[model samples]
Target: MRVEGAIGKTPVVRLAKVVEPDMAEVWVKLEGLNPGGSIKDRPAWYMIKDAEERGILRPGSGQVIVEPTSGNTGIGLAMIAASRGYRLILTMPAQMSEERKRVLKAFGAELVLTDPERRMLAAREEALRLKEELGAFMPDQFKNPANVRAHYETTGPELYEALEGRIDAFVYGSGTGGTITGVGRYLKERIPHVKVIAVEPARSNVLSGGKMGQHGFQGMGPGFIPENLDLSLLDGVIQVWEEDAFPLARRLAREEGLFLGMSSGGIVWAALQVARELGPGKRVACISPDGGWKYLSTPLYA
Candidate 1:
């Protein structure tokens, strides 16, 4: 398999010491193993591949692919665009991790940083501006159903095959809500009893009727409900604090040797709760969005 072939089929590892004895068997889907080192590769490839099939994007057309991303998606797009012979431009928040900015630049992608106050939303504005100005193609992960379909077709099926219909719960955090909605909907159709939990930062429970506020957890809440999110697929909501999330990420590295990011920590933390609720008879699985390598500069490592 080439680099694109290595994007999916990420391993699922069962927890040993990290989970409590009384809790359901917990498994972490290691998406960090993807070529781009994040789950965004799934949707990023899906969106772009679909566009190419439909003739919206052609090889060596010199089309400028523009989009707003927090980090992983931008990096994924950079990799994809580079491999497919397209010019790539990305917009991101000024406050995004420096590692992300440097990674995008390393991928040879043009970078545009927006005001920190506007956050990810600021990037959205600049992406739209560039789309018009450059006549670029925007994958629009937040609003694109292809983002949802990516997981439905790949992530969900991989989990089902790995667990062989034994999974009792699926837990994940939402950025564009792609992973949660796509995987949640797919698993529900196959295993109707499977509990689906959507996690967001406690500081901003935007989906739980709470207002968005300042939060340290990146790549989850974007201060607004993304269009790709489907409430019908959710069985519950879990709000995790940065205090709980960041520490657990460090613990995952130390104890489980899984150096994952905040979204991974938050979802696993929430998965533990769901496991305890269901007890020892069930199996709970959660998405580990990315590894900790890109977050080394942040206090998450310190």
Candidate 2:
């Protein structure tokens, strides 16, 4: 498949030995294998391609695209822009991973680092400022409906097809709120009883009505409720700490050979919780947004 065509339909694998024998079956969608290396590729691809078709993003016609991201989305956008002949600029908090920044630069994207104190909000403002100054198209993933629609159209269906609509629970961490809300909303329509478990940093449990706090789980918490998240669709909220996620991530690599990111590890941790609650004969599916390679700079993987 062409690089772009290789974006979706990633494999789903069971964690037979990882979870306890009496617990429900735990499965994960390997989105880390995407061409751009994360589930962000799905939304980034859909937004860019749709915008280009609608004349919002004239890629080769001298139009520039800008967006604010903690990591994955920016890299995904950079990949699309670099290959499609567009100038891309990404704004990220100063605290974001070095590996992510280098990857974006390697894709030929310009970077603007904002204050870490303000978190993703700072980056969003910078992106908006640059968009106004440069007359660029900003595919604001956090608020953009297309980001949610992308998952509804692709990720959701892929999961349903993989599990044949028999899944008992769905688990995911919300970055732009695209994946959980989109897929959760879609799954709810098909299987009314399927539980939707939304995971977030325990430090910043905004999704669970807790005050926003600093968290190192990049691409999961933005210190605020993202516009793309659908609170009504969520069946439950899971709050996890970065300290806990790191070891779980390490365990996923060591025990399950998943080699996934912290967010995925948090999802797995939540999936395990849901599985034990439901007991055996149930099936749980979680999303592994990206691989562990980008997190080596962070103490979590180091």
Candidate 3:
């Protein structure tokens, strides 16, 4: 199965004048380049393929995949599962963008919409319960070890090379903890002094040792400690306000021509903090997962 073009390497974009001239060497990994418009595609591809390798999918058997995703993972899974002729069950908040619904349906994935007030848990809980009752294959990324392997093999290496091995600080968001843990681990191994910072929204900054609350609906900000997150690999965490990040999201689009999601904006805000701390002649990188599609109504950039 040559899934060569099925996924892609998100480009390394240099920040253009959002910070001081001395801190101008900052760059961000635009994981939005992936097929599903987010970094999750890497893990989604790896987890499914790993299952196939381990005989999780029997010979002459049809694989039924199920997951609870905010959007990106579902899109990635839809692409992978459809291409492989697997039956996929996507459970998500009913209030997700119409585009999200369209993509899943166009890819021939089934959807189970749940209450939006439950935040994302309604969808996640339904997926777990369905898998138990229906015996469907669950690619629960939070608990799946292969999720880390994806970034370890792809995203991390690409970023390291993109910066020409000069990145001194790495900041990223933690969802399943796969991105931060896996990428952070790989970068730190090569450069032991590399600073790994985790950025999450202030409202739901669980990894920052801050109390959780309702957060804006775009990306970043984890409510729980993902099973895959290794705390020791991280140096510190930062939190960004949704209001501030939203403005930055627009600025990214209007100024840089990068229409990224709100959380990516938050991650950028924090990444600059790391840059300022290091002062001049230092390199810094941040991972911007997903895109602006999911946040259209929240505050669409004109």
Q: Considering every candidate listed, which one attains the maximal TM-score?
A: 1
lDDT of 2 by residue, 28-58 (tens): 9999999999999999988998898787876
Better of 1 and 2 by lDDT: 1
Candidate 1 Cα misplacement greater than 4 A, ranges: 95-97
Better of 2 and 3 by TM-score: 2
The top-ranked prediction according to lDDT is 1
TM-score for model 1?
Answer: 0.96
- Point out the higher-scoring one by lDDT: 1 or 3: 1
- Give each model's whole-structure lDDT: 0.87, 0.86, 0.81
Against the true structure, what is each candidate's TM-score? 0.96, 0.94, 0.92
Alpha-carbon runs more than 4 Å astray in model 2:
94-97, 115-119
Report RMSD (Å) for each prediction in the order shown: 1.5, 1.7, 2.1
